[PDB]
Amino acid sequence: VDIAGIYPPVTTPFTATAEVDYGKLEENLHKLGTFPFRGFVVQGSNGEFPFLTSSERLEVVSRVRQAMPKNRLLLAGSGCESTQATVEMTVSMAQVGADAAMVVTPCYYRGRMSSAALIHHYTKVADLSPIPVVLYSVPANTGLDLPVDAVVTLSQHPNIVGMKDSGGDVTRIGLIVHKTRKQDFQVLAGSAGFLMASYALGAVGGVCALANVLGAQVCQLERLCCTGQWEDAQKLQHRLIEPNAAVTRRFGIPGLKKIMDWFGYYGGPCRAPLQELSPAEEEALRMDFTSNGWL
Amino acid sequence: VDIAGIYPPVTTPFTATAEVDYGKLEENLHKLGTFPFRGFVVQGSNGEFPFLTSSERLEVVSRVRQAMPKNRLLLAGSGCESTQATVEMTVSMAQVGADAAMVVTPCYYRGRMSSAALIHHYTKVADLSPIPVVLYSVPANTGLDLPVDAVVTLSQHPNIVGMKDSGGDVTRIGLIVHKTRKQDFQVLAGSAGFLMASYALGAVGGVCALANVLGAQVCQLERLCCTGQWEDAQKLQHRLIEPNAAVTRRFGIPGLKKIMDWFGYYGGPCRAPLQELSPAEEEALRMDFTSNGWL
Amino acid sequence: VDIAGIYPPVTTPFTATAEVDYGKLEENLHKLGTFPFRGFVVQGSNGEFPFLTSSERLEVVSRVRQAMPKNRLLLAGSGCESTQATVEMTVSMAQVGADAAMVVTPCYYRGRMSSAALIHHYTKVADLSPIPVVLYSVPANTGLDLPVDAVVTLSQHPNIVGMKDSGGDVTRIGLIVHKTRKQDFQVLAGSAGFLMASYALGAVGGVCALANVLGAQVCQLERLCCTGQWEDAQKLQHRLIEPNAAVTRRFGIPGLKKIMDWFGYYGGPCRAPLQELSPAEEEALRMDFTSNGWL
Amino acid sequence: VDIAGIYPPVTTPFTATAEVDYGKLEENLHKLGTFPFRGFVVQGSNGEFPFLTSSERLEVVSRVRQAMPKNRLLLAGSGCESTQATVEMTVSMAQVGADAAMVVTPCYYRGRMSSAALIHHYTKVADLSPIPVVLYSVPANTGLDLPVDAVVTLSQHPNIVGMKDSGGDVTRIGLIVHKTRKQDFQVLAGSAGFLMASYALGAVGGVCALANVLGAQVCQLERLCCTGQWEDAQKLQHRLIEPNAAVTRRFGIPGLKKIMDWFGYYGGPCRAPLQELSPAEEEALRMDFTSNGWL
Ligand SMILES: [K+]
Ligand SMILES: [K+]
Ligand SMILES: [K+]
Ligand SMILES: [K+]
Ligand code: NA
Ligand code: NA
Ligand code: NA
Ligand code: NA
Numbered sequence A, B, C, D: 001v002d003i004a005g006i007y008p009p010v011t012t013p014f015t016a017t018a019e020v021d022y023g024k025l026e027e028n029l030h031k032l033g034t035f036p037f038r039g040f041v042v043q044g045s046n047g048e049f050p051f052l053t054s055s056e057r058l059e060v061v062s063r064v065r066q067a068m069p070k071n072r073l074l075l076a077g078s079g080c081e082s083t084q085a086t087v088e089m090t091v092s093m094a095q096v097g098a099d100a101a102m103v104v105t106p107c108y109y110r111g112r113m114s115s116a117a118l119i120h121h122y123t124k125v126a127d128l129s130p131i132p133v134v135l136y137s138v139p140a141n142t143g144l145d146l147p148v149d150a151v152v153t154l155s156q157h158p159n160i161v162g163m164k165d166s167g168g169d170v171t172r173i174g175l176i177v178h179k180t181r182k183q184d185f186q187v188l189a190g191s192a193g194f195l196m197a198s199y200a201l202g203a204v205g206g207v208c209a210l211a212n213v214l215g216a217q218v219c220q221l222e223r224l225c226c227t228g229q230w231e232d233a234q235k236l237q238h239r240l241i242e243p244n245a246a247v248t249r250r251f252g253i254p255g256l257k258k259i260m261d262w263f264g265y266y267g268g269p270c271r272a273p274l275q276e277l278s279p280a281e282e283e284a285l286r287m288d289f290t291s292n293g294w295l
Helices: A022-032 A054-066 A083-095 A115-128 A148-155 A170-179 A192-201 A211-226 A230-250 A252-262 A279-290 B022-032 B054-066 B083-095 B115-128 B148-155 B170-179 B192-201 B211-226 B230-250 B252-262 B279-290 C022-032 C054-066 C083-095 C115-128 C148-155 C170-179 C192-201 C211-226 C230-250 C252-262 C279-290 D022-032 D054-066 D083-095 D115-128 D148-155 D170-179 D192-201 D215-226 D230-250 D252-262 D279-290
Strands: A005-007 A039-042 A073-077 A100-104 A133-137 A160-165 A186-189 A205-207 B005-007 B039-042 B073-077 B100-104 B133-137 B160-165 B186-189 B205-207 C005-007 C039-042 C073-077 C100-104 C133-137 C160-165 C186-189 C205-207 D005-007 D039-042 D073-077 D100-104 D133-137 D160-165 D186-189 D205-207
Touching (some): A005 A039, A005 A073, A005 A211, A039 A054, A054 A073, A054 A083, A083 A100, A100 A115, A115 A148, A148 A160, A160 A170, A170 A192, A170 B230, A192 A205, A192 A211, A192 B170, A205 A211, A211 A252, A230 A252, A230 A279, A230 B192, A252 A279, B005 B073, B005 B211, B022 B211, B039 B054, B054 B083, B083 B100, B115 B133, B115 B148, B148 B160, B148 B170, B160 B170, B170 B186, B170 B192, B186 B192, B192 B205, B192 B211, B205 B211, B230 B279, B252 B279, C005 C039, C005 C073, C022 C054, C022 C211, C039 C054, C054 C073, C083 C100, C100 C115, C115 C133, C148 C170, C170 C186, C170 C192, C192 C205, C192 C230, C192 D170, C192 D192, C192 D230, C205 C211, C211 C252, C230 C279, C230 D192, D005 D039, D022 D054, D039 D054, D054 D073, D100 D115, D115 D148, D148 D160, D170 D192, D186 D192, D192 D230, D215 D230, D230 D252, D230 D279, D252 D279
Parallel strands (some): A005 A205, A039 A073, A073 A100, A133 A160, A160 A186, A186 A205, B005 B205, B039 B073, B073 B100, B100 B133, B133 B160, B160 B186, B186 B205, C133 C160, C160 C186, C186 C205, D005 D205, D039 D073, D100 D133, D133 D160, D160 D186
């Protein structure tokens, strides 16, 4: 029940020898816990989930749970390529305390990931999941959009409670909110760049990589939008566009981690094959933040 | 000066023998004149401008002028592939009474249409145009987005007064409004599907193919947005999404003309190579309107 | 009848004041006439046809005719966006001496350029053309591939004698040769980069921008391929790949004109909005030629 | 050393309860062993590797080894998203008898999979692999092409012996063969559809899903190409284009498995989320084979 609100999709910190740094993870989460988030999204794209072993994925979810108040929502990335693997991942993450499973669309075989394929995959996971399911569409990583007709069909399932859409197409989001209006189905935006427009069209939250460093600003944007302060919402939204692009489509996770370092959080390195930013990328990353008055 | 408001991009009617039907054009414009539009956009993509001879393009603009109150704005599509041709088209359209020139990005050589190329093309047209210039970005027809840095540079020109963006990317629109905030530069949305989100991010109007048949609804959406009625704006916006897609990306101009017939306007045929809708397309077109309560 | 062989798609030279330089055009054509080409392709993409007035397009075709032996084939680019305009352009170009009309696919309304639309457009032009018609598919400029099923249907027309394919997909070319094997229908490659593979799959020629400067090399590649010298064909083909990309997808017509200058032909400027190469582009253009031993 | 020749990328058979059917796998491999292949490619895209557990991936490679003559080459798909995971997978597959590791490009974070990222990933795997490494580029699944400059750099590594390219762009393949001519680096085509053109440009083999059912035909195409029988090679190549597309881009693995059933091999079901073909897809699959005289 109820997923409305702002979540940072949390990173996975690593040591100099590429192990998971649970100390730093815990430290970062205590800092982020100060912000009026609804909870944490663990092992979204931003958590480098493809780079973790099965049991790292489990242990990460468990530690996040232990570093959170119990009244905060833990949305766990349990998607795998295969339907059966996904079910098992979802069950095990429920067991270490996830409140909901966020399930990315299988996409290695886009060619054959039709509506019917995606509908079946999600229906089976929802049928067998002990926790509610959130659809997760993120085309910049997957090359695929969960189609609208599939979303509408899936919204009817009692154990499918909403979706996070990362495509940034507000017409699509609007259409989804409209077409699922008769269902218990809540739409979360997938980044801080199009949060305002999303609320305008009926989304009731956002999972934003940018809230790892500008949590208060992102939460302020939520408050302005829910409160009808659209004029101030606009000024704030505008100033978040470039920093948001900076840590998402422009420089990705290495950009996010670098910005985290600069803001006093533990950003640290990514796992190979992800690389450090070149000096020119660092420079450009700094510009997107400083020229919008954030650094 | 001042381009804010709603415009229908008007179609060009043709006779059974594919001539321009100026009688029907005039009849349609008298009907559309009843709606509180800011004016008419003539020879946008929706006017089938690529299919008209030089002098048809001129005569169409002239007739529209004669069928309009003088206090209504006539934005004329004067873009051609070559910079020099564009200048000449812009001058001649000024002479038959256009208030502003809407100039589509040259796109046959996308490969070489860099920022500098587009900046030069527009600077020359703006330098030599007797009327103000509106940038026109429509990737679904062109395969190219006028890049943001080019838009920002061009917004500084005294004779470039805004742009119509048809891409539907509200983050991009937001960014443009933000980055040009210090200039006289007004942003118009390029369709009724993302009108609300556009106003939210700072656009001050829309050129909407859908206003050829639901003019009052589109104008109502404008009123709700300017008036802070965001909740009602939403309900209305949602109901316009599918009919809007129906006459734009789904069925294009033949879809628009068919819907016009059904609403009692003169829609008529397009010029070859455009074709009639198949019966199944007609059926689907009807569904998008009837299931949203418009027909 | 019979379009097999190599053609350079000829450029249109311009003066310092952007007029058509017919003197330079004639001079270039006398030089290119030395090579064993089948003829000239006039007003392909490489002739900047979108940038010319109606009557420039006509006069260019007429002058090329006058500078050619009558036993050489003049393929004239007569495509326009509208079916009727295309017919008229085709008729008038026949009158100034074109041997065949090369008709680019209308593409401003890709969305509605279905197979049936393209089939009708071409059937009408072929029905009314006094000269044979060659289908012209060039997606890098158009954003569309003439679909295979349309090509097969059109190959059955008595006045449609082949196609130039510029996409570079040899599986598609192979399929087309196979599926039209029962018809009089000859396939020309659209660039020197994939000429060898094209001959291997059944194409019987090429229209190559690169033959404006390496005519003898391109003709040599033809000779090696027709003669079964596949091993030497390979060595030669390899050395043509980068210079070919240099004057096509990398630097386009400005790249071609620059290379023409350097080889002693008249390259000259393009019409705005096309721009000169930056010094770094010039440098890279030089590298693609020098490191493959051509300059 | 030496990877030239034809390989079928073998499927993974499953039981009615979605277990790996090692009996059927072994039976299929004994049948395919009759054809003059160079060996087997195990856990390419066609083996549904993303759908298998770690130890299934290992056990599959081990069983294939046991069902093969030792003089036949086993190329094992050991790629994972993370560089470290890939190293471990490569080591363990070497241990169960793989002759070479075929390593797909990590692609979940395309945005950050630059040349340098891909160069580092492959250099580390090649540095630590006990067996030679084959680069694997398959954009239809990944959304990314291993860039040419990266391929050229990697070809210099002593433990990187070639690549399988699945993109079908023969200009790119030609360029790669040319640019790596000074290295020990062999290029394999990624499908039977562009095998002939590949040999023409310098590839020395193919990994072809189609050889699971038309092994003798694919091997015949190899023989005709190596033997200079280009005219017969062409006739044969043409007839393989549609059946090849049928079991790859059109209907994928379910299409391949269905065709396998019809040819008397064990095709069987895929793992969810992959679905059965609809009756209309089955029909179309049958057409692509029957109309080319194969069924
Ligand atoms: K539900
Ligand atoms: K201005
Ligand atoms: K024919
Ligand atoms: K090597
Ligand atoms: Na709902
Ligand atoms: Na402004
Ligand atoms: Na033929
Ligand atoms: Na080599």
